[PDB]
Design a protein around this ligand. Structure first.
Ligand SMILES: [Mg+2]
Ligand SMILES: [Zn+2]
Ligand SMILES: [Zn+2]
Lengths: 257, 65, 101, 41, 56, 293, 42, 94, 101, 146
């Protein structure tokens, strides 16, 4: 197993994992969506609502705001999550648009990760007061508790023999999108680190002159989040859940016979 | 009906880039680069931002006490 | 069972009534159950059978050259209720890999 | 000469809808019933 | 003596109703079973004493 | 689970907003004036007899017999309490109604199989001289199993299963489909327009301008196919898709588009009802009709 | 109490005519109370 | 995670695994194919609405080892394998 | 859900367009639509669509196709009416018969 | 017949007058309709192959100069009933304007009604599907009133 980090942007990462196989990566992938826990607003207690929207819609939006989840403070790999409750209150008054950065928290560590989200517009004399409650939850129970995304693809190499008329266009096309090309005295090697749309001019030679071979055991991943957890950390937390999950199984096996 | 704060397929915040989009496109700046200039890669996130109507300003005027 | 009712699925509604007295209930289970009505009295042929995906999928499963790798065979016999022992055996083609016709 | 193109004809048509109403018959006939048709009966 | 379909249903139906109102059951033990399902196991062993008077 | 016109919908998509809608109804309890001089009087029905519901169905009323807003109503909860005068102390004598001689209930209740929350309680005067109250109640209603969806071409269908987002096949990019349509419905009905709209929505989303599709002078078919390729996608609308259950590419290419659907109002909440043993007619002795009876 | 068409509150009970003393109109809206209610956010 | 044994026979075991989904299930099945003695190993989720948390496993050996022993060694593979990947990860982002 | 006739009808001619037998006659005094010359019994004039559903129908041809499509709509609801009454006759005539032993 | 028509286009007489010449081999009739419930349709008059009133007026329609009231008085648009349409040889597009066409259609895409116009690319579907699709647009859920 050896990695090769291609690019690290603010709250996203793309890398190339090697030395695993098809089964294991899906265990990894599915776990990031459905297991890694975050914080999200569970219920809302309204005190007064003279705004232009119904009670449920505003209540619904409060649950969608991504909240910073400090991973060094409880246990995010535990099978029995902690029931620690945070109270998000707000008292606002029109005119003006209510932003996400106005929410007050009862604990300085859990605040909205992105402060520019419009919640609801208030006109003259319309008061709006509420106390949102946040708890921990998992993605499989409700989609508001999702840390992010995982997409993976087979890493393939395309051999394009120089007998094909106008092979140069492929070189020109590949360079425009940024794919590593190595050239020699027979053909060009194109590494498909991203989607490669072949033009119709070449579809009649698909097979003969041009053939694609899969590299066994090398996957390109794309992980992106929303600001609740650092993207460097998601994979770390994910693997620990996997390990912890399997271990229990052995303990249950002995208690059967 | 103020812009959906998440997309409907790809989980990614989107309300924070609606307004800044709209005023810039209503001055002549071609949409096919404004969207590209912001963090909008796939097209699934893009459909929800392009086609939307934000009727909330008309309805707000009328009242129910 | 959606040729005999002549139902489709775009909102059609059906009703269900439940018989009560012990003679009536018994009578319903022995004489009107679905399995006693696979052949139709109108013409000598089966009425309850495969529909659209059932037929088309059957073609792809049995064409010249539909070699299913070992993992898939194992996975699909457990999806169809049937329950066999360690006789998937014996791997007709092992040239490329050991696989099943 | 370029005859028109379809697109310019669209501008002609466009004027017809904006100026008058889509519900022309119920509105126009009632307006005529108020002046002429009342005194007639 | 092979029953017809209609006679079979009736015999079960008659027998089931007797089983509710008393009328001791043969070996039909398992776990909680409706009076209908009781008549089915008894019939599967060919011990139903009801004979069909055939009109002939 | 989508054969013969059914459609599978992405669980996550429902849960973030797609197709949510609200139902509304409003009741019109007035104040009749009998010619004899008596009147109705909206007051909280004194815990006595003659039509009294007996439980705490009247807990939600205020002092004057009108609810105040944002109080969850359900089942047969009472909205406004009236009291209509019998006007004839000896007219009926229904074998026990001689001693009480009280006052007839007639209070307006919400229909049996509905729920939700009250929204506005108007109160005003009528054209004659009485007082009528109109109370409206709203209902959340999430798109669950059985609701009807249909495009604008004629592909009617019912939601078949609301599968978790993870077990859904996805394209070698970030796209995850929302609605998986049965492939046996396109070359059977002959709706070629459906395929053209799918490609047309993909080009339209990427470019950013909205494709013009008016009959006879719409955007020529060949331009959308020739533009789709130069934007970076196989011309035919197909891609390489990975099956979300196990995880291996399907040995075919899987079509994908952007089609405009629309939710129809034949919602399952207004069809299901059951009868145990109801009140029937007296003179003809037949059971009653409809959901309100 | 009450509240009317684009103005201020009124007194409680009734016996006679219901009119708003300033816009001469007669249509009332029953104002929302000042309590707390638990709305779950699914 | 409770194991309800449905049927036990000579070199054959079918059982329910309460609380699991496609994640752990799929991974456990193809990990068993590296063990040369386990001839057959499958899973299924009967009707995913009424129950999609308890699947049904079937493991068949050749007699020289019990299915119970075979799982314990097989599941151990995952633990060791996942550990290696985690070590590479942490020793990368530096 | 097949017929080779409709797969071909998506990449070739639709063909003629008829109404209960005769070709299209119902129109103006001497022609069908006001876009043809009076007194033309030609192929293109009397309702013959040449383009397919892929390449697209022109305005004259599209209108002709609507005349042939209303035919199927009207009929299907009418044929049911006569059938239902007819069945009531034969049921109330034959329901008494049984097979003796 | 030529006299009354040419008079109407000049704006001398009220615009609701249409004259049609029935043309049997041994019957001649001339009809003048002036009732209150006839269903008409707008068409552009063309003479000698050149459709009357070209881009000079389109520039002014796109500008704020002449509305539709000004057009029908000037003599470009003509309201044709069923009866007057009996003698008209209407064309479709501005490309097939030989020296025989009496009138010329405006945008033909307005043939269909207000709900069937909601279907994109209607000329590519089968006739029964469009009927269903048009009929279902009248039942969707949405916002139709602020
Ligand atoms: Mg049906
Ligand atoms: Zn998206
Ligand atoms: Zn007022």
């Amino acid at each position: 197993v050896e990695f090769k980090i291609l690019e690290k942007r603010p709250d996203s990462i793309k890398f190339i994992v090697s030395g695993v196989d098809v089964p294991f990566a899906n265990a990894l992938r599915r776990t990031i969506l459905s297991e890694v826990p975050t914080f999200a607003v569970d219920e809302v207690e309204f005190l007064e609502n003279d705004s232009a929207l119904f009670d449920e819609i505003i209540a619904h939006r409060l649950a969608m705001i991504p909240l910073t989840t400090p991973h060094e403070r409880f246990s995010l790999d535990a099978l029995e999550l902690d029931d620690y409750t945070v109270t998000l209150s707000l008292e606002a008054e029109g005119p003006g648009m209510v932003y996400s950065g106005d929410l007050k928290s009862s604990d300085g560590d859990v605040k909205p990760a992105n402060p520019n989200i419009p919640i609801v517009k208030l006109a003259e004399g319309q008061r709006l007061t509420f106390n949102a409650y946040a708890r921990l939850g998992r993605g499989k129970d409700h989609a508001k508790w999702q840390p992010g995304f995982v997409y993976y693809k087979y890493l393939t190499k395309i051999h394009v023999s120089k007998d094909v008329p106008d092979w140069e266009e492929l070189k020109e096309l590949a360079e425009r999108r940024g794919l590593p090309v190595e050239e020699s005295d027979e053909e060009i090697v194109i590494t498909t680190i991203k989607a490669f749309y072949l033009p119709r001019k070449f579809e009649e030679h698909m097979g003969k002159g041009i053939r694609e071979e899969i590299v066994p055991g090398s996957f390109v991943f794309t992980v992106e989040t929303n600001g609740e957890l650092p993207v460097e950390e998601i994979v770390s937390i994910a693997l620990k859940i996997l390990m912890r999950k399997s271990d229990r199984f052995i303990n249950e096996l002995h208690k059967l016979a | 009906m103020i812009v959906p704060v998440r997309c409907f397929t790809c989980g990614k915040v989107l309300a924070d880039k609606y307004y800044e989009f709209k005023k810039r496109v209503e001055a002549g700046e071609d949409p096919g680069k404004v969207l590209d200039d912001l963090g909008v890669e796939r097209y699934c996130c893009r459909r929800t931002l392009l086609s939307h109507v934000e009727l909330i300003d008309q309805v707000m005027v009328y009242k129910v006490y | 069972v959606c040729p005999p009712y002549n139902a489709d699925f775009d909102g059609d509604e059906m009703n269900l009534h439940v018989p009560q007295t012990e003679e009536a209930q018994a009578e319903a289970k022995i004489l009107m159950e679905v399995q006693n009505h696979i052949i139709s009295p109108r013409y000598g042929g089966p009425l309850i059978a495969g529909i659209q995906d059932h037929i088309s999928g059957g073609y792809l499963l049995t064409r010249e050259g539909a070699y299913f790798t070992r993992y898939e065979v194992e996975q699909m016999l457990m999806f169809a209720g049937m329950d066999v022992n360690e006789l998937p055996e014996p791997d007709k083609y092992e040239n490329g890999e050991p696989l099943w016709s | 000469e370029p005859t028109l193109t379809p697109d310019e004809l669209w501008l002609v048509m466009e004027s017809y809808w904006k100026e008058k109403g889509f519900v022309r018959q119920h509105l126009d006939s009632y307006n005529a019933f108020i002046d002429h048709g009342l005194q007639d009966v | 003596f092979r029953y017809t379909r209609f006679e079979k249903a009736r015999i079960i139906g008659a027998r089931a109703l007797q089983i509710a109102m008393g009328a001791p059951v043969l070996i039909d033990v398992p776990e909680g079973i409706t009076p209908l399902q009781a008549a089915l196991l008894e019939f599967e062993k060919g011990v139903i004493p009801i004979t069909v008077i055939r009109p002939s | 689970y989508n054969m013969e016109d059914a459609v599978i919908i992405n669980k996550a998509s429902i849960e973030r907003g797609l197709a949510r809608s609200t139902f509304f109804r409003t009741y019109e309890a007035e104040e009749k004036r009998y010619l004899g001089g008596q009147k109705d009087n909206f007051e909280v029905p004194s815990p006595n007899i003659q039509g009294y519901l007996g439980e705490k169905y009247y807990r939600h009323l205020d002092e004057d017999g009108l609810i105040f807003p944002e109080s969850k109503v359900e089942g047969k909860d009472v909205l406004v309490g009236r009291t209509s005068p019998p006007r004839f102390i000896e007219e009926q004598s229904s074998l026990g109604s001689m001693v009480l001689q009280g006052r007839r209930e007639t209070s307006v209740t919400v229909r049996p199989s509905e729920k939700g929350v009250v929204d506005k309680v108007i109160v005003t005067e009528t054209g004659d001289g009485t007082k009528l109250v109109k109370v409206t109640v709203r209902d959340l209603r999430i798109p669950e199993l059985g609701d009807k969806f249909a495009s604008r071409h004629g592909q009617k269908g019912v939601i078949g299963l609301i599968v978790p987002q993870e077990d859904m096949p996805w394209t070698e990019s970030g796209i995850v489909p929302d609605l998986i349509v049965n492939p046996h419905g396109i070359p059977s009905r002959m709706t070629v327009g459906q395929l053209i709209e799918a490609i047309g929505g993909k080009v339209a989303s990427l470019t950013g301008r909205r494709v013009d599709g008016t009959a006879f002078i719409g955007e020529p078919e060949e331009k959308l196919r020739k533009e789709l390729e130069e934007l970076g996608f196989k011309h035919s609308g197909r891609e390489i898709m990975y099956d979300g259950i196990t995880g291996r590419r399907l040995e075919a290419d899987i079509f994908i588009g952007v089609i405009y659907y629309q939710r129809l109002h034949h919602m399952v909440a207004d069809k299901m009802h059951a009868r145990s043993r109801g009140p029937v007619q007296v003179l003809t002795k037949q059971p009653t009709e409809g959901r309100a009876r | 109490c009450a509240k009317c068409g684009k103005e201020v509150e009124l007194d409680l009970a009734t016996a006679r005519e219901v009119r708003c003393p300033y816009c001469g109109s007669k249509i009332l809206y029953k104002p929302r109370p000042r309590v707390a209610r638990r709305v779950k956010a699914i | 995670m409770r194991i309800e044994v449905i049927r036990r026979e000579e070199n054959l075991l079918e059982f329910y695994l309460e609380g699991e989904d496609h994640t752990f299930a799929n991974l456990l099945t193809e990990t068993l194919h590296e063990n040369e003695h386990v001839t057959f190993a499958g899973y299924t989720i009967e009707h995913p609405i009424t129950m999609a948390r308890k699947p049904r496993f079937k493991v068949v050996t050749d007699g020289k080892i019990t299915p119970e022993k075979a799982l314990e060694e097989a599941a151990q593979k995952i633990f060791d394998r996942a550990r290696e990947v985690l070590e590479a990860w942490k020793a990368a982002i530096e | 859900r097949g017929k080779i006739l409709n797969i071909t009808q998506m990449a070739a001619m639709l063909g003629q367009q008829s109404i209960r037998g005769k070709r299209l006659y119902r129109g103006y005094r001497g022609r069908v639509l006001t876009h043809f010359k009076p007194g033309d019994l030609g192929a293109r004039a009397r309702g013959f669509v040449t383009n397919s559903y892929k390449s697209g129908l022109t305005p004259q041809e599209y209108f002709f196709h609507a005349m042939g499509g209303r035919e199927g709509l009207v009929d299907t609801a009418v044929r049911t009416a006569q059938s239902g009454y007819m069945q009531r006759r034969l049921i109330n005539a034959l329901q008494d018969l049984k097979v003796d032993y | 017949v030529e006299r009354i028509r040419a008079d109407r286009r000049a704006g001398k007489i009220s615009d609701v007058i249409n004259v049609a010449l029935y043309e049997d081999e041994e019957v001649k009739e001339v009809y003048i309709n002036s009732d209150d419930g006839r269903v008409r349709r707008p068409l552009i008059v063309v003479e000698n192959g050149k459709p009357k009133l070209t881009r000079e007026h389109v520039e002014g329609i796109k500008n704020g100069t002449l509305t539709w009231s000004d057009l029908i008085r000037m003599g470009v648009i003509e309201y044709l009933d069923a009866e007057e349409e009996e003698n008209a040889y209407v064309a479709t597009w501005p490309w097939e304007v030989t020296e025989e066409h009496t009138h010329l259609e405006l945008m033909p895409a307005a043939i269909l009604g207000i709900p069937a116009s909601l279907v994109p690319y209607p000329e590519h579907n089968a006739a029964p599907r469009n009927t269903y699709g048009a009929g279902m647009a009248k039942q969707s859920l949405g916002l139709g009133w602020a």
